[PDB]
Design a protein around this ligand. Structure first.
Ligand SMILES: Nc1ncnc2c1ncn2[C@@H]1O[C@H](COP(=O)(O)OP(=O)(O)NP(=O)(O)O)[C@@H](O)[C@H]1O
Ligand SMILES: Nc1ncnc2c1ncn2[C@@H]1O[C@H](COP(=O)(O)OP(=O)(O)NP(=O)(O)O)[C@@H](O)[C@H]1O
Ligand SMILES: [Zn+2]
Ligand SMILES: [Zn+2]
Ligand SMILES: [Zn+2]
Ligand SMILES: [Zn+2]
Ligand SMILES: [Zn+2]
Ligand SMILES: [Zn+2]
Lengths: 699, 699
C-alpha cells in the first residue's frame, strides 16, 4: 500500500528516499528546476512503463523503444504508469476527437441499432425502394466507420481530404453517400459530429424515442451521456467531435486524454500528470478537481505536479522539494498534509500558503500616452469581426475563458502582421483587414519555451553575447600576446583552437550493429573541447574550460572587476538562472530555462523604447516565487520604455497588470467578442465577466 | 472487486456473461475448441492491452500495432493485462537469459562494487601496475555491460559472434580483455554466467566476503539470491545465464517470463497464462503451483487455462465451458469451487474429477517381435554417449525430467536420420555414429501442431483427399454429363470453374492510404469461390458450395451411401473433428485442429506395416476426454501394424504405453543417461526413478 523509493540519484537528486501512499491524491511541488519533475517522470513513470513494456512481445517492445533505466536502488509497490502531458503530435489524419474519446464507436452502434434508413436518390424512406429501384444491404455498424472499405468514401479513401484540399465528393464527411442517408432525429452522423459537445449532449438529452427504441438502445445512450458529461466537466464543452486530433493544442490534447482515461475506467494504474490546470480558467478549477477526484476514486494513484493553491488544498498528501534549484535542490524539505506544510517553517510552498510572502497589488498604475494599436476586421477562427485597442508603453494582459479566441487573435494575427511589417517575414497572417499604429513600433520579439538551439555548439553564454567578451578578455592576457594568439582562438566554432577530433562538439558518435547511435565524450580532448595548447593559457588561475564549467553564481564574484561581463552575469542571475552553468548544452535546457535565457538576452539589450514583446502563458510550470520573479522582470521591461503583451490565466499576474482585455463571454462559437477593457479596477466592476468577478474577489 | 463481462460474442461464444473475482486464483477449463482460450485471450487480454496501449504515445502505439476490438458489450473492473504463452521469437542476439531475467545488471553492480582488479598483461593484482606500466580507469558498472562501448568487445561489437562464427578475440565472452580481469571469488563475470543456475546459487550461498564487503554489498546479494531461488522454484535449475534467448524452447521461454514477472514485483496486473505446466515433469508441479500462488499474493489476478488435476485442486475459482466444441460449445456449464464442480452433474471436468469416467489401465501389453532400432554413439547436446533400443510394432513413450535431453535425442537425431535415409532429405542430423535396423522401416512421418497450409486454397477436405472423391461424384451426376463437364471443373485451383474475380480464393485485397491491407469477401462470387454456371449443378439438392459449407457431422449422414467418402468422414469424426467444416481455411485452423487433421489423414492411409510416427507432446492443450480419445487413436494406429514413439509427460498416457524409456536422473549436465527401460510395471520397480515412483503411485 506504499511506493517505497530508495537511492534516487537521477539528475540533481541528492540520494533521497520517499514513501508515497497508494490510491491517494498526491501532489509534488517545488521550485522550477528543483528536481520534482525529474523525480516523478524519469524515475516512477519510466520504471512503471519499462516493467510493463519489457513483458510484452519482442516486436512491440523494440518498436516502442528501450526506455533508459533510472539511477534508483530499488522501487517497491509499483504498477503500470500512464503519463499525461502537453506533448502531442500530428500523428495521422485518420484520428479525430470522436475516435480518440471512443464515442464514435458508440455513435456508430446507435446509428446501426435505431437508425432510420433513407434513399439518397429519391429522398423517401425505405431493404429497397420501389421508386429508385435501388437495393441496399443490411445495416451494420461497420458501414458507419470510415476506417473500413464498407463505409469509407472511395474518392478520398475515407480521409476527408485528398493529399491538402477537401474531397469534392463527400465534402469532408469521410463517408459514402448511402451511409449519410441514415438519420437519427433529423440529423445524420456527420451533422451530429459537427455539433459542439454541449450542444450534442443537450440534443441527446431531449431526444425522443419510441418504447421499443428506448428498450433496445439504453446502454449506448447511457455511455454516450456519461462520456459527454465527462468531457464537459473536464472543460472542453466547446469542441466538436469532427475536429482533427492534430489541430488541437497541448492543453486541449492533455484534457482530452484525461477525459478518455476517466471514461475508460481502468483500475490499478498509476497516473502522472504535468500541470492539468494549465491553460484553464479559474472558474473551471473546481470541475477539474472534481474530475481528478472521480478518476482517483476508480482505484488509482494520482501524482500531480501542480503549483495551484486550490490543488494543494484539495490534495491528500503533498511532497515538497527544494529548498532551491539545480545544485541547491533535489532534497525533500517538507512532507505531509497541507496543514503540516503550512505550519512547517522551512517549506517554500508553506511560506506562500500561510501568507508570509505574497504579491502586493500596486498602489499606482501606468496610463497610456496617446499611442494605441488598432486591429480592424479580425475574423480568424471564431472572432466576430471585432476591433481591439492595445495601449503602448504599458503592461497589457489578455484574459478570457478557454476557447474565447485570445491565443489565435494574438499569435496568428498581431504577431504575424508585425513580423511581416518589421522583420520582413514570409508567413501569411490571419484573416484581418489592417493594423493601425505600426509606425510607432520598431521591432517585435516573441518569447516562448522553444529550445534556443539544436546543437551543442550553442550555450547560454554565447546566446547572451558574453562569450565574445570572455574571448576578448582571454586574448588580452599576457600569455596570448606573447604567443601571438587571436580573439577567435578560444572558440569551438573556428579551426585552430578547438580540438580537431570532435570538431569542437566535445562528443563522438559510435554506431552499434543492432543499437542506435551512442554519444560518448571525446577521448582526445577529454570533453574539454579544446587542445592542450589553448588550455595552457590561464587567466587568474582558471582556463577557458574552467570558466565555461563554473555556474552563474560563481561568475558573479569572478567577474566583478569587468563591468561589461558583470552586467550580463547579473542579468542572468536576476532572471533566476544563478544555478545554471555557462557551458551547458542548449539541447539539455528545459522550456523554462530557455525562456529565462531569452528574457535575460532581451534585458541585456539596449532598448530603444520601440520594442514589443509577446508572451503566451509565461507562467507554465512556475512556482509562486518564480511567478513573483517573472512579474518583477516584466514590470522592469515595461519600465524600460517597451511594450509587453501577455496572455495569462493566473490571477496573481493579472492583478498586477496595467491594462486588461477580456474576451468572451464563452468559448467556441459562443465567444470571440470583447467584454471588458481598461484597468483591473474598472474590469472588476463589470457584472457579466468571470474575470471581473474573480478580480473583485481577489482585490 | 469483480471483472464483469457482458455480451461476449467473440468467435463461437453464445452471448455469455460472467463475473470473474479479482485478486484470486481463477482457472478456465473446457474441451479443445470450446471457446475458453478465445474468451480469455481475445476478450480480456485484448481489452486490457488496448486500454493501456491507446493511452501511450502515438508513435509507440502505432509501432506496436492496433489490436482488434473484441465483440463485447462492456467490461467493468479491468486492469492492464500481460499474457504469457509459448510464442517466443529469435528477436536479437543482444539478449540472453541473464539480461531477460534482469540478473546481469545485479551481477554488473556486484562486480563494480566488490570486484577485485587485476592486470591482464602481467597477471598480478592492482589504479595502475608498476610492472606492465599500464593505467586503468575507474571501475564502473557500465564497463561490465556489453551493450555500451566502454565494455563491448571491439572485434565483434559486443555480440560474441561475427556475422555465424565465434569472435576469435573474446571467444564469445562479449567483453573486453581488461573487463574480464576483474574476478570475484576466483571467477570473472563470464565464468559466473557460464555456470548453471543451481551451481551459481550454491556458489553465491557459500561465497566468503570481508566485513566491509558484506556491509557494502547486501541488497545486491539478497536480490540475486531471491531471483535465483525464483528461477529454481520455477523449474529451470539446469539453464545457464549465458545462453542465448533465441535458442530456448517455448516452454523454457514461458517459464523464464513467469520467473521474471515474479521477480519484478508488479502490482495490480491481470496475468493470463496458457498451460504453464506443459513441458514440466510431475515432480515440479508443486513448486510451480507454489510459485503461481506467490505471484498471485503480490496483488494480482491469475487467469490460468490449465487442464491439470493438481491445478484444479489448488485453485480458488473454476469456470467451465462447454458442453462440447465449436457450435456445441461457447457456454458456461459449471462455475464455482472444485467441490461444486465435482458435485455438478452436467460438468465435463467434474465427471472426470469425481471418478465417473477414467482411463483404464490395460490388462495386457504387447511385446516386441524381435525387431529393434539401435542408436549408437548419441552425443548431441548433453547426451553422454548412450545407446538406446527402441522396439518396433509397439507403443513407446519417452519420459524423463525437463532438460534430460529426450527431445533433442529424438527430434534432432532419430527423426532426421530416418528422414535422410528414407525420404531423402537435406538436413544435417545430430552428433551420432549410425542407426541399426533402418531396413525394417519404409517411411517416417512427424506429426506436430504446425499449420497444414498458408493459403485459403488448402482445406481439411483437400488435405484428407476426400475432395477428389467429392469432385468425381459431382461430375458423375446427370447434369454434368449433359453439359459435358469434367472432374476438374469443381475445383478452385484450375481456371474454368472457379470465379475469375478472386481467382478462387474467395476474398479480395484492399489497400488503404495509411492502413494495412484489408481482406473482404469477393463481390462477384459472394464468397462462394465459384461462378453461377458451376453452382447451377446440384446433387441431391445441394451444390458444391453447400457441400463445402456443411460440417463433418452433417457429412456423415449425407454421404452414408458412398462408402469411400463415408470412411474418410468417419475417420475425421473419430479424430474428434465432428464440429469443423470441410470448407474451413487452413490459415484459421489452430494447432490442435491441424494435429487432428494430420492424424485423420494418417489413419485414412493404407498402412503397409512399416511406418513410424513421431509425436512431441501431443497432449498440449487437451482436456481429459481429448486425452482419452488421443490414447485410443494412438492405440488403434499401433494395432494397425505401425510404430509410434511419443515424448509425453502425462501420467495417464504413460501408464497405457507398452514400452517406456527413462532419461535422467537430472537435467542439463546432470542428465543424458538411461535410467529405466521396459514395461511400465518393470519401470515402476526402479527406486531411483521419479517416473517409476509416480507410476507405482498411480498403479
Ligand atoms: N485549426 C482549427 N480548426 C478549427 N477550429 C479551430 C482551430 N484552431 C482553433 N479553433 C477554434 O477557434 C478558437 C481558437 O481559440 P484559441 O485562441 O485557440 O483558444 P484560447 O481561448 O486561447 N484557449 P486555450 O488555448 O485553451 O488557452 C476556439 O474556439 C477553437 O476551438
Ligand atoms: N542450442 C542449445 N545450446 C546449448 N544447450 C542446448 C541447446 N538446446 C538445448 N540445450 C541443452 O541440451 C539439453 C537438451 O534437452 P531437451 O531435449 O531440449 O529437453 P527435454 O528434456 O525434452 N525437456 P523439455 O523441453 O523441457 O520438455 C538441455 O540440457 C538443454 O539445456
Ligand atoms: Zn428510394
Ligand atoms: Zn471523400
Ligand atoms: Zn576532441
Ligand atoms: Zn600489471
Ligand atoms: Zn569479441
Ligand atoms: Zn470472385
Amino acid at each position: 500500500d506504499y511506493i517505497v523509493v530508495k537511492g534516487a540519484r537521477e539528475h540533481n537528486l541528492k540520494n533521497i528516499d520517499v514513501k508515497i501512499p497508494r490510491d491517494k491524491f498526491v501532489v509534488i511541488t517545488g521550485l522550477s528546476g528543483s528536481g520534482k519533475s525529474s523525480l516523478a517522470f524519469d524515475t516512477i513513470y519510466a520504471e512503471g512503463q519499462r516493467r510493463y513494456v519489457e513483458s510484452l512481445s519482442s516486436y512491440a517492445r523494440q518498436f516502442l523503444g528501450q526506455m533508459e533505466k533510472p539511477d534508483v536502488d530499488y522501487i517497491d509497490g509499483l504498477s503500470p504508469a500512464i503519463a499525461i502531458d502537453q506533448k502531442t503530435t500530428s500523428r495521422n489524419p485518420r484520428s479525430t476527437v470522436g475516435t480518440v474519446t471512443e464515442i464514435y464507436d458508440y455513435l456508430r452502434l446507435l446509428f446501426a441499432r435505431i437508425g432510420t434508413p433513407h434513399c439518397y436518390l429519391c429522398g423517401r424512406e425505405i431493404f429497397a425502394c420501389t421508386e429508385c429501384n435501388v437495393s441496399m444491404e443490411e445495416i451494420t455498424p461497420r458501414m458507419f466507420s470510415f476506417n473500413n472499405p464498407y463505409g469509407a468514401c472511395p474518392e478520398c479513401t475515407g480521409l476527408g481530404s485528398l493529399m491538402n484540399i477537401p474531397c469534392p465528393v463527400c465534402k469532408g464527411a469521410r463517408l459514402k453517400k448511402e451511409s449519410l442517408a441514415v438519420t437519427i432525429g433529423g440529423k445524420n452522423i456527420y451533422e451530429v459530429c459537427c455539433l459542439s459537445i454541449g450542444e450534442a449532449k443537450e440534443f441527446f438529452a431531449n431526444l425522443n424515442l419510441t418504447e421499443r427504441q428506448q428498450l433496445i438502445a439504453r446502454q449506448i445512450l447511457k455511455e454516450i451521456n456519461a462520456r459527454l458529461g465527462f468531457l464537459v466537466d473536464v472543460g472542453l464543452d466547446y469542441l466538436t467531435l469532427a475536429r482533427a486530433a492534430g489541430t488541437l493544442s497541448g492543453g486541449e490534447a492533455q484534457r482530452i486524454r484525461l477525459a478518455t482515461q476517466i471514461g475508460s475506467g481502468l483500475m490499478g494504474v498509476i497516473y502522472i500528470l504535468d500541470e492539468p490546470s494549465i491553460g484553464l480558467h479559474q472558474r473551471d478549477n473546481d470541475r477539474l478537481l472534481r474530475s481528478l477526484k472521480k478518476l482517483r476514486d476508480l482505484g488509482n494513484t494520482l501524482l500531480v505536479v501542480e503549483h495551484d493553491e486550490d490543488t494543494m488544498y484539495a490534495s491528500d498528501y503533498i511532497i515538497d522539494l527544494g529548498p532551491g534549484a539545480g545544485s541547491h535542490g533535489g532534497q525533500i524539505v517538507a512532507e505531509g498534509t497541507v496543514e503540516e506544510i503550512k505550519q512547517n517553517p522551512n517549506s517554500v510552498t508553506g511560506e506562500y500558503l500561510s501568507g508570509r510572502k505574497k504579491i502586493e497589488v500596486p498602489k499606482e498604475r501606468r496610463k497610456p500616452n496617446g499611442k494605441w494599436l488598432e486591429i480592424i476586421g479580425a475574423r480568424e477562427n471564431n472572432l466576430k469581426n471585432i476591433n481591439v485597442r492595445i495601449p503602448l508603453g504599458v503592461f497589457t494582459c489578455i484574459t478570457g475563458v478557454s476557447g474565447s479566441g485570445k491565443s489565435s487573435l494574438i499569435n496568428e494575427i498581431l504577431y504575424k502582421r508585425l513580423a511581416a511589417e518589421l522583420n520582413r517575414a514570409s508567413v501569411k497572417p490571419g484573416e484581418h483587414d489592417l493594423i493601425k499604429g505600426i509606425e510607432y513600433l520598431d521591432k517585435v520579439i516573441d518569447i516562448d519555451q522553444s529550445p534556443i538551439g539544436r546543437t551543442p555548439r550553442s550555450n547560454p553564454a554565447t546566446y547572451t553575447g558574453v562569450f565574445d567578451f570572455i574571448r576578448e578578455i582571454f586574448a588580452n592576457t599576457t600569455e596570448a600576446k606573447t604567443r601571438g594568439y587571436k580573439a577567435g582562438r578560444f572558440s569551438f566554432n573556428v579551426k585552430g583552437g578547438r580540438c580537431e577530433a570532435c570538431a569542437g562538439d566535445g562528443i563522438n558518435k559510435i554506431e552499434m550493429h543492432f543499437l542506435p547511435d551512442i554519444y560518448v565524450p571525446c577521448e582526445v580532448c577529454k570533453g574539454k573541447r579544446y587542445n592542450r595548447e589553448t588550455l595552457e593559457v590561464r587567466y587568474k588561475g582558471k582556463n577557458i574550460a574552467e570558466v565555461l564549467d563554473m555556474t552563474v553564481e560563481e561568475a558573479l564574484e569572478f567577474f566583478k572587476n569587468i563591468p561589461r561581463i558583470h552586467k550580463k552575469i547579473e542579468t542572468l542571475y536576476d532572471v533566476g538562472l544563478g544555478y545554471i552553468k555557462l557551458g551547458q548544452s542548449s539541447t539539455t535546457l528545459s522550456g523554462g530555462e530557455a525562456q529565462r535565457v531569452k528574457l535575460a538576452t532581451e534585458l541585456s539589450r539596449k532598448s530603444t523604447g520601440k520594442t514589443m514583446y509577446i508572451l503566451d502563458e509565461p507562467t507554465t510550470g512556475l512556482h509562486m516565487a518564480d511567478v513573483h520573479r517573472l512579474v518583477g522582470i516584466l514590470h522592469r521591461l515595461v519600465e524600460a520604455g517597451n511594450s509587453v503583451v501577455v496572455i495569462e490565466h493566473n490571477l496573481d499576474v493579472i492583478k498586477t497588470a496595467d491594462y486588461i482585455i477580456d474576451l468572451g463571454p464563452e468559448g467556441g462559437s459562443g465567444g470571440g467578442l470583447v467584454v471588458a477593457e481598461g484597468t483591473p479596477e474598472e474590469v472588476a466592476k463589470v457584472e457579466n465577466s468571470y474575470t471581473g468577478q474573480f478580480l473583485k474577489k481577489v482585490l
